[PDB]
Amino acid sequence: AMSLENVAFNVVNKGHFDGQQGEVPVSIINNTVYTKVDGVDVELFENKTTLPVNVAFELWAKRNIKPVPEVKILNNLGVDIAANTVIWDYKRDAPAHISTIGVCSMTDIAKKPTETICAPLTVFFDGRVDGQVDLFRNARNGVLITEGSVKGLQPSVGPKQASLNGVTLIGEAVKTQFNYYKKVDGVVQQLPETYFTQSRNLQEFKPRSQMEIDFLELAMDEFIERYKLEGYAFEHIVYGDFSHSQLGGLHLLIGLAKRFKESPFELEDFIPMDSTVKNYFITDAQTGSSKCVCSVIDLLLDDFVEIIKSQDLSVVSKVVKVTIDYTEISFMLWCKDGHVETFYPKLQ
Amino acid sequence: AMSLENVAFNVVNKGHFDGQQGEVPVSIINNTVYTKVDGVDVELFENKTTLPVNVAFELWAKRNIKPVPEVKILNNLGVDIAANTVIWDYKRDAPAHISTIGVCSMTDIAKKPTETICAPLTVFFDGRVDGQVDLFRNARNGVLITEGSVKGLQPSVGPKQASLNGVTLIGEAVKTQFNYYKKVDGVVQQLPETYFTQSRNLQEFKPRSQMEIDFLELAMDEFIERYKLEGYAFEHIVYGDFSHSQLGGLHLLIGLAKRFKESPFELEDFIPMDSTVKNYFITDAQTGSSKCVCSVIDLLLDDFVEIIKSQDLSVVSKVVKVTIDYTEISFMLWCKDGHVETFYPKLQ
Amino acid sequence: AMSLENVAFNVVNKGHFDGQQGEVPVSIINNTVYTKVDGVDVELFENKTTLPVNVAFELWAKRNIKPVPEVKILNNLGVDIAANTVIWDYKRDAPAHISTIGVCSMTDIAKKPTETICAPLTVFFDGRVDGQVDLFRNARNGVLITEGSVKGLQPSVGPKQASLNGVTLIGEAVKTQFNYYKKVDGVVQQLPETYFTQSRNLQEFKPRSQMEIDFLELAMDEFIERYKLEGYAFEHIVYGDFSHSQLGGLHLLIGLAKRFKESPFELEDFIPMDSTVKNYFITDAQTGSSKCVCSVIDLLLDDFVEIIKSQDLSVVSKVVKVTIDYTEISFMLWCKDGHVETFYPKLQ
Amino acid sequence: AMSLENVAFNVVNKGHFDGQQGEVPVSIINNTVYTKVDGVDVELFENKTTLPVNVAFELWAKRNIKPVPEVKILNNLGVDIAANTVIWDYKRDAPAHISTIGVCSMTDIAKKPTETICAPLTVFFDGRVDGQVDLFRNARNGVLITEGSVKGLQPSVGPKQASLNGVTLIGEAVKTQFNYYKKVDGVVQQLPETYFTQSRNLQEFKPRSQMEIDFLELAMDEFIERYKLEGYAFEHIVYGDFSHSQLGGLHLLIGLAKRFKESPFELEDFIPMDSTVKNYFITDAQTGSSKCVCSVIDLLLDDFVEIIKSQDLSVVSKVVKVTIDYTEISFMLWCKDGHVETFYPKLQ
Amino acid sequence: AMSLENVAFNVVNKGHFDGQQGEVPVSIINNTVYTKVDGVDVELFENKTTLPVNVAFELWAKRNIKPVPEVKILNNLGVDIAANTVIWDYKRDAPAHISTIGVCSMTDIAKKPTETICAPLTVFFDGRVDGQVDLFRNARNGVLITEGSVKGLQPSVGPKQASLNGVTLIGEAVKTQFNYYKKVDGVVQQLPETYFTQSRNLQEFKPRSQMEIDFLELAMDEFIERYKLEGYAFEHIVYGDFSHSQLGGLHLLIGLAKRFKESPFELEDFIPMDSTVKNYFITDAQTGSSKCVCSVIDLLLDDFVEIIKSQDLSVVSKVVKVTIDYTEISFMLWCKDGHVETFYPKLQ
């Protein structure tokens, strides 16, 4: 017996939908859900989605509260829909997926992923839930996560981090590193060898290697000397050039982190979604150097160094393809006289 | 001559409603009030309430700008309505009470609290306003605050802190510690002996006793030794256990404050109102330990220590009732072999 | 071929309107613009203006992304409208001006500023754009900025700072200090000699003179002694008096900055627009001292000292007029026995 | 080059989307689309759909303006989606189908019905459009209408009436009677024998047989005698019984039409959609006789008489199934002593 | 003392704004204004304009309640703004003009039409209001109506009809036929000779000449014979041709009125504004004959006959220009062998 008032009862009493019986009085006004506590209205939910307020409220209440893959990983693997859960996208304040399976009468296209409507969709399955590995084996199209071996299925070791109630973290009390599997058109697909983005924020950035500690602590010239980076244009690509009206380079999050400690800047996140590569309109507060589309990726600096040192430096310009978060990220590499001029995630 | 434009004139010229004459041009669009300053619209108010935008604007403009009791105290004393003022609830961005007396033509049930409609309501009276102690004596149901003695009325000394324009503070330039009195059904009611919550935030938490300084400065084992807390399960209740998927204990704000200095965590305030006990959906960023309903109370640690050491430790489970902010807070106490296992504000 | 979908294409691909060809799918719901990225809606813009959502979106996308004068300067110079650009007011999240010239089919009153409808409007012209100095010479009413000499036009050297994508800054990689010129009724107007406000925030306040370093570092009595300020009431005007229920003085931002480092306070910006003088409803957290209308100006302390020491101290009360940001700011000066009692921006 | 402004231009200049180049200025406010005509706003569209206002506007503009099957026919034949058109549902003021093919970038799941996502969907094909008969021949699942014979397919002769811009009519200047063909999983179906509803209104009801002429002109007793309808309870079922608090019978639109000529009544259309059977909350103004759910069907009276005279009258109650508008309509037939008591579309 | 509550008081007590003192309690929710009557909310106004709800409410309340020129007349004469009144546009449910003079603080650009901002605007002046003839005499740009002669100005005799509270009528108890005068750049214009539209409705159409009486009463062939209209294609242009899928002709309202008596049709008013020529998407219910853009004008039939009989019938196609309601209306005239084929208001 699903009901708005039952969803609200669960949110008030359990902090999320927990299948408990009960009802509280609700008022809906515009995109806000309220409940009456002792004669006054208390806000339970503000709809930021393109769904109806009461529907969004239910999907949010029914959000997966276990560690789940970051939405950028799901998107990069082509996930269309989840089996019997909601992956809440905390970057969009909205469901990661438009439709559901066995969650909500307004958004369900099916009660179970075995229904024929689901066959052409890439369904996300969670091996931590009884039955879902089997549903994956039966599905035409899917992505599966597990905490361990699945007999006969060749695994891909995923990122260390996952999202737990919108907090990206490397679990200590809980497991966040999953095996991944994918099927297309009834056929298990070998996932590519990949780097993973580190999913750090500017404000709480922490180095995760001696090389990153050195980059944050050393001055530019000593770091470049110590790690033999002469001719790799880290002065432009990583450290950034704030000397002209157009901000030069600055494509690695650690480089933004180092600048940020010294002087503040504005990052306008003009397409605010989770993605392997982020684009910001950056305005440097100290200098007034700015750039409308500054592509930024959070690679471990050691991974970026491995990538750039792996490149042939003998052509003027070429597209370099690097597998990151399971997706092919195109970089533009510009060279002159066997040194790098710039290397950036290629703007589409 | 009350008018939207007159309310707006007061907000622009006086920073709140101050009974001054004058008008400014206003535009209302959706839930926002704007005024025209030199040919452009400037936002004066965004309605977050369930009232009409123009009505909410007026109540907010007419908010009490003296120190007033925190809404949790008023709610715990059963206050329904205020005499000739608006207690603005800065935690809900809304009026603390649905109706008014002598404030606003849309929300007034009466011009004066002596009207018979008010008799069954618990009316909040403010002895700092001429006439209101007398109105309390005449009222069937009420709560009264004063800065001093009321002849023949036995006082209750309230919390040290009050709310001044949404800032909870212990007044130095102004008095925030009131005498409280309550009447039910025409009869003055003896208020119970009570502890008071300290109303601190995680971000700006300051200790208020040598014991709290010690808790914040010492390591866990030395604090527990120094204050003879062996067998009282402070390791679970106060310090918190982040070792399992479900976060253990962590029910005292000071304990959250100590953790917060070391590593960040998310507190989802899923019923965002003022209350003696708060419930959060907590996600620890470092460990991934989490709990959907983590009850948190900000007691002076000395008061909590007094409370828990006062308990008989010889039953498995029992409900312990403690008067806090004038209300009966139920705690669950779980013991084994004469030591505490856990002691938490009982989830309803 | 202007279109909502073309505006959205530019925002997604270029971070702002850049005249590029292309379209993306858009959804408008309430005041929010979304675009479809891989089957889900991503928010591009939330309308906070009194214009239609799609119109506001276009003006914002077409915002000037060069350093431009702070809106308070434009307003103080009487600017009504801009030639062929949008000055976005980041303090109001709205266009600085109601109408446009050659920007947007819904808001344009003209395609070019030479149209007769523009003659009575003070049009903002930007000498960094080809043709606009000539348009200024032809305009009946206008304000012109340039980076250099305009033959025969007597310049006014403007503030050091300008606004670049809502960041107020003194440019190092870009020029933010302009020459200003104004015309009224076909006649070039001599701009007055003026001080300029420094446009600092409380949170990131930095001193810009030895005197400001001294004010922030010294104790009150040594600062006043060192700078010979006995009898100028800096104890009240600058440092502020938190000893009574009404907060005394505190009219200079540097004084708020010094207090802020010690103890937090609330500033309610109840008319949130850019202005030379700002009015706050201030609540001091430590003391409970408050003031409904606290006028605050960010003058270099040396400029304020020059201003107050320039005054005749022999009348009880008088209005003192000071040109600041090109506008006449009225101050009330109250004296007793040849010493200052108070000196504040006069509340209108 | 698809664009809100281009859709608006077509609506203003062509009365609907007609693929013309051009732009008009548009404003969107709440669910309304306006265009500027000589400096004032003129309403073009009010969104009554659950889609975004600008999307609904485009699908409306792109509505099919030829006679098309009534939505109830399409729904009954299981049509999911239309090939390269929008069937506008004028009963719901909304698109008949969730998704589109080759119409609108926000709603399209495909550009052509040959794409694999369309294979499981019952696609509507219109033989009046070049290529669509052949697309039906290649489609796995579809419904096809034609004005004439299709080589190698036996037709089902459809209703005489079709919908032209929300006007249901029997064409004299245009053809409204289609051949129907349907395919499920690649197999041409033999559509069942069916009656058709007549799609008439109460206010402009016209008889379409001599029996209907006689029913409207004669008194009940004369009509029942002429057509030998003794014992078939037409007094109840068709004429209606307004003698008790609950209105008896009245399940045939012609009987509502007859009452309506004599005295008015209220029909609350509480599920306002196109359906073979309609349910109304009916209140008779003359008598006060009412019924919460009065099922009403517009059958030619001769067809209804054929149906009721083709039943076995020997059981107290049973379900009678009748193919109408290609769907199975359940009636309840209640009999006593070999005569009808009532017969109504089953409220199930 | 202008105020939302005072406007509401006037609406409740005087049926419109009448300058009376008083206040009622108001609530604004979305675009609706309500007032409280004995504890319940009663709707006073639903905003259909692009202005803020409270502003639209005031301009509506302050509407001109005397007979005033139809908006199409004012628009055709180039009126920008009205002197000290609001011409309410009942076709758009919105003010006829963007701005006001001496009406409303939000919309006023001036208090008096003598202010310099009004000099370039064509201001509407009403000689029925003391002082306005003289204000017209002093105005650079205006239109003036009067009931009688103005010393030294030759009048243009206007239409017989005017709008009184959105009812277009020819006054018997009040004067609706005005003298018109217009000034451009300080010079009294000689207004052109003009026909006038008759502003009639389909539902209450009344003939205003013996020719119109005859057109309504006689069969097409008798009428055409009586008035010698052979070869002028009235069969097509006026009577309409419902024989083909595209509805032929039907451009004269009297011909729609005649059809409408026999059989109903749908007229979609897809640009719902007052204009000399109206465009309808017409669907004939009897035949299914339809046309996306059917231009319709309500000329006295005698005037239309004079116009068509005053053209040269010797070319295949040309533009015929006719002054109607003071504006230049373009018709397309198509001829063959010296007879008319069609003649219609040009869809341009």
Author numbering:
A (entry chain A), B (entry chain A), C (entry chain A), D (entry chain B), E (entry chain B): -1 to 346
Sentences from the paper on this structure:
Here we report the results obtained during the fragment screening campaign against NSP15 NendoU. For the fragment screening campaign, the chosen crystal system was obtained in a citrate condition and hexagonal space group P63, containing two NSP15 monomers in the asymmetric unit arranged in a dihedral symmetry, which can be symmetrically expanded to reveal the full hexameric form of NendoU inside the crystal lattice. Over 1200 crystals were soaked with different fragment compounds or nucleoside analogs, resulting in 997 datasets collected and processed, with an average resolution of 2.2 Å. Despite the high concentration of ligands used for soaking (100 mM), as well as the large amount and high quality of crystallographic data, only 26 crystal complexes of fragments or nucleosides (2.5%) with NendoU were obtained, highlighting the difficulties in identifying fragments for this crystal system, probably related to the large solvent content in the crystal unit cell (74%). Unfortunately, the NendoU active site, which would be a primary target for the development of a competitive inhibitor, was occupied by a citrate molecule that originated from the crystallization condition in all refined datasets, which resulted in a small number of binders to this site.
